[PDB]
Swiss-Prot record, chains A, B, C, D:
Family designation: Belongs to the peptidase S1 family.
Organism: Hypoderma lineatum (Early cattle grub)
SUPFAM superfamilies linked to this entry: Trypsin-like serine proteases
Enzyme Commission number(s) of this protein: 3.4.21.49
Disulfide partners: C30-C46, C151-C166, C176-C204
PROSITE patterns named in the record: TRYPSIN_DOM, TRYPSIN_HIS, TRYPSIN_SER
Gene Ontology BP annotations: collagen catabolic process; proteolysis
Principal EC category: hydrolase
Catalytic reaction annotation: Hydrolysis of proteins including native collagen at Xaa-|-Ala bond leaving an N-terminal (75%) and a C-terminal (25%) fragment
Domain Peptidase S1: 1-227
Protein name per its UniProtKB record: Collagenase
Length: 230, 230, 230, 230
């Protein structure tokens, strides 16, 4: 997160830290959201070629956690398109983790929330991605959700689709590399509305909107693959 | 590095820490070696699909450095084979950095050294890869160089080639994920003999040898691409 | 607030901005908390000698508000002691303001919360007081609540009493001049636990605890003077 | 300033903005005049109980300056009477500031000017006091200097004395709360004749005269305390 603020342990109890080992032996970092005792929701671009994932929960300090578990299964969206970031969502199954004061799930949309586009709403994004600073502490910032029409003109045709939700970064506060898969949340409602998916080709300090996977568009996929009815 | 020793600033002044941003926006970590004021030698598997790299020099703390520089250009071996790790070498051109107590280049082999296979010599490998400990301090260990024949027996046929140099990890001391691109050095000679290339399919704690790109095999390529004679 | 972060309009809907004119004609700024449609809770040191107060509500921008009203009456605690800051609480009666999306009351303690000391809890403090920066935007930070025994040793004898609640500023984030009267809140419970009362004689960047009026100790006074049963 | 004109940087290069921290920890704003590279002349009612002051010079924007300096010492008139505003003058010693296009000293009266009462001359008053507009830009207006006799008739007996100089505000243009300590200057002569001292009990919009400390009456005190001869 560029120009973010430091979180303390317990502030974002649903935040997951993912230490990912790829098929090519590289080590990648991504964020994720705890949506159930046994499930983490993240971005497909983070784990589509992952071999294993160490999941950190319950701490603002990177590579630390009140619970540190290994992924049991990775379910990357089958129609994920690497070129357009279309369908950039994935589920990581983990051993049952008991909720505590620092480990709590984030709520997923249901009912009417499924038809809400959340335009012009301030949401909170958090992660351990690149920042102007040198810190291992979880950072966060607020981004205003903009309408898809305005967002679509900031990217090449075809990138911004119905299943995309964008956050404005015109104030210089923005998710950056390493924040991928992280939660975009309506704090008031403890509701997950997006998953950090992509930053503009212009970079994190371009003032361009950041793209997120619109959670309401993937609720069927989530329920079907987790078997959980949210 | 699993079961390694803890380094400190100034101990390995040729060690580069690479914070890599990939074309797919993922953030990757790799090590490298300072071979000239403007050049870093690392593994092709680390940066073949990278768009930019932040280079940390002169500090044993991960993501810290006496000199923090951005890559100006990345030259990855055009004949690199992702499947076999053949020709796993790359160069990162950086803006001229002045050598200090904590920032020094490592010697590259020349003349007769170019014909040495370095069999049965203890070499030092260093990096910030997985260590089974949550530390941000650079680790290192000594691995014995074994002959390619003995090493080939431990890998699928065709993986270990003349341009591969292996380090034995039977002591249980071994480079691991995240150490990729790191230096394999003959300490007493201050000579670079290998670049961390691949771990065994069995993992880091299997006592299997680790493969490195044999530097003597790429000295022509390095000189061709850097325009520097050694 | 020193080393705080910027709030957006609607983030802290209970925050009040007070533009105070004193008996000596000086113009002072203090924060306050909206506790009812007709009442603002602030510090006695801010208004004990005030002639009039302009109350700003509903905006993160200083001197701006969705509702801007004038005080009708000021009720400063009769036993306020200027020398020790004992009983540093005051009520400002204002014309009925209707709650909106950006103007909401903060909840006051009741029942069991009245016996809770809130030790080792992270609370949020906000205001437009002195900051390292040049900004008219409301800032906030988090301070850990410490026990009174630890706090008492950081000040001359007699300053820290039962009715005082302290926040730790050892991380360099702290309320500063102009933040006086502002809210110290348990965000999770939307609960007001303290009113910014005093900074150490050593200043805002001393790392010394900041004293707040412990709201639970003044609930009777509040209910009796507002006539409202919380 | 009520009903004044908007200034801009460089227009009143002698204007000082004072962010004052009081002994009671309250934050107060007052204006002042740069009379020397190391001295600011202001009102005693502003700083008699102050512990420190941040001095803003060279900018028309409140809390901004080409030079932002901290007070080194504050000398308030020892015979200042809070009840009558008698001897309402103070000096703030600051670290030597170099004059620029936007930072220049104002002339102080000497010789014959010391005997001039300046009756019936238009003087310019400036400040960031209350303006019935939410602006952060310095305002100014012209007020006619009236004779003390005419002025005394508008105030309770004994308030207007020989060391008081009054400005008529019958046009509805008047200094107001927050303008305290500001300069009252004969523009064409670049001469300081008064320091904003007090507004009428009737308020700023009553057309009553505003009292200023008559600078010619304090020239001896200023020289005594600054060790500078004018």
């Amino acid at each position: 997160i560029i120009n973010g603020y430091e979180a303390y342990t317990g502030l974002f109890p649903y935040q997951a830290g993912l230490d990912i080992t790829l098929q090519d032996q590289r080590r990648v970092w991504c964020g994720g959201s705890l949506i159930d005792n046994k499930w983490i929701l993240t971005a497909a671009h983070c784990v589509h070629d992952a071999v294993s994932v160490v999941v950190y929960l319950g701490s603002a300090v990177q590579y630390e956690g009140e619970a540190v578990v290994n992924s049991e299964r990775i379910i990357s969206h089958s129609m994920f398109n690497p070129d357009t970031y279309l369908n950039d969502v994935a589920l990581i199954k983990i051993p049952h983790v008991e909720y505590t004061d620092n480990i709590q799930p984030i709520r997923l949309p249901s009912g009417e929330e499924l038809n809400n586009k959340f335009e012009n709403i301030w949401a909170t994004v958090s992660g351990w991605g690149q920042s102007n600073t040198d810190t291992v502490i979880l950072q966060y910032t607020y981004n205003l959700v903009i309408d898809n029409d305005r967002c679509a003109q900031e990217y090449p045709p075809g990138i911004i689709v119905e299943s995309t939700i964008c956050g404005d970064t015109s104030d210089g506060k923005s998710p950056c590399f390493g924040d991928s898969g992280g939660p975009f949340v309506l704090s008031d409602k403890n509701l997950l509305i997006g998953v950090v998916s992509f930053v503009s080709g212009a970079g994190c300090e371009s003032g361009k909107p950041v793209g997120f996977s619109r959670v309401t568009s993937y609720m069927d996929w989530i329920q079907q693959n987790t078997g959980i009815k949210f």
